[PDB]
Amino acid sequence: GEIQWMRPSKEVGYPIINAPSKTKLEPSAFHYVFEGVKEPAVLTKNDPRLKTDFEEAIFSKYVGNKITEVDEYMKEAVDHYAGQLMSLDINTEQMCLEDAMYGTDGLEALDLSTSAGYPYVAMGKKKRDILNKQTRDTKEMQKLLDTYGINLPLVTYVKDELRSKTKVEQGKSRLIEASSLNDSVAMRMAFGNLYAAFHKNPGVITGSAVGCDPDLFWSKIPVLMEEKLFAFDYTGYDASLSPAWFEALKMVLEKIGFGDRVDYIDYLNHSHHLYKNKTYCVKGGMPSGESGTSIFNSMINNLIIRTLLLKTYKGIDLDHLKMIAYGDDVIASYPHEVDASLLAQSGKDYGLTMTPADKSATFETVTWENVTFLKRFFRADEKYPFLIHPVMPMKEIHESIRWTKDPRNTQDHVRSLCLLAWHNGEEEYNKFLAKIRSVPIGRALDLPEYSTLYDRWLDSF
Ligand code: NA
């Protein structure tokens, strides 16, 4: 991804976009009961914590575009993946406006708490004023589509979240490039059934894990992985994608029956954004921060891994590449050992910056004991080995519980963390509950005990 140009929005006929300047994150009632070192990400140029130009820092994610065309290895990767998706017999029909809006089997309804994007954000018109879940009314939306059409500017927001001290000082805040409600609706109508098909088939055929329930899915993953696992992390995945990866994606859509609307991908690839009082044009780069793009990111990941394997190991049998992606995160396997360090080298030439899995300093062998997917490890249950625990370390949960975005959601926030933490074991889970109950706020929460969560887990299979 690369920024073509940037300049005053008024110069191209756009209004200034008002974005919040103060974090909604604040110390929670557990701030001093649990250890933590993360703070709210910088949201404005004038943050006292900054030690470098803010604007420069947030846009530095666009490292440029290392490739132009789709080479021979990418074409091969496209044929193999597309061929693989074909076995799913995906409904290529466009989805009706209603379902695209309020959901159907395999597709959750539009999120009402997220931005409606341009131009609604400049007219102070919310999503709650356009659709109601009770009526499933399409009249208002239909009128808005007819009025403002599609291919509208994406509105940029700095993501309000916890970041390390280093990332705060270096102004490295992540960004959300929210597309207009019109485009999200149009895209869900164009690809609605593809999305549903993926959500209902998380695994190694779709090569995707979006829509999955870790508590249940973790027990299925091992039986899908090959003998030798391999993995690595990306640095700025979305922003690094060159236009070629988007073309590769369109070829896949074409071969599986969606050639009808591959134009929507151009909208993601070559897109223009609004940020404050500035407007800019980006070539390449997948718009970040929205869930409407995690499937295409996942699809592209499948194309990337396949490409690097073909380029690095001619003769590789892609039919024995078993991988599952979730955006840039991935867990993969092959009957034979592979060199992630070598693959990372091939990656550079394709505009991808790959590093050791889970921030190691060197590329080590990935095993079932050290592998993580969505920050979670894999641990067989002591009593029923065939049941696999998705284990997220307590460090993450501790960091998160030390802050709040709304006292009214304290119960849900803490309950959410409990669903993640009990997997660390009864002894650890109880220490967690005891500390929570060491302060008034915690003692007033309704939280599940360990045996209750274990029982519920067994009853969910
Ligand atoms: Na883009």
Swiss-Prot record:
RdRp catalytic domain span: 227-342
Compartment(s): Host cytoplasmic vesicle membrane
Superkingdom of the source species: Viruses
Protein name in the entry: RNA-directed RNA polymerase
Activity control summary: Replication or transcription is subject to high level of random mutations by the nucleotide analog ribavirin.
Cofactors: Mg(2+)
Span covered, complete protein: 1749 to 2209 of 2209
Cofactor annotation remark: Binds 2 magnesium ions that constitute a dinuclear catalytic metal center. The magnesium ions are not prebound but only present for catalysis. Requires the presence of 3CDpro or 3CPro.
Binding residue positions for Mg(2+) 2: D233, D328
Reactions catalysed, as given in the entry: RNA(n) + a ribonucleoside 5'-triphosphate = RNA(n+1) + diphosphate
Membrane topology per record: Peripheral membrane protein
Amino-acid positions noted as binding Mg(2+) 1 in the UniProt annotation, renumbered to this chain: D233, D328
Function: Replicates the viral genomic RNA on the surface of intracellular membranes. May form linear arrays of subunits that propagate along a strong head-to-tail interaction called interface-I. Covalently attaches UMP to a tyrosine of VPg, which is used to prime RNA synthesis. The positive stranded RNA genome is first replicated at virus induced membranous vesicles, creating a dsRNA genomic replication form. This dsRNA is then used as template to synthesize positive stranded RNA genomes. ss(+)RNA genomes are either translated, replicated or encapsidated.
Species: Poliovirus type 1 (strain Mahoney)
Assembly with partners or alone: Interacts with Viral protein genome-linked and with protein 3CD.
Cytoplasmic side: 1-461
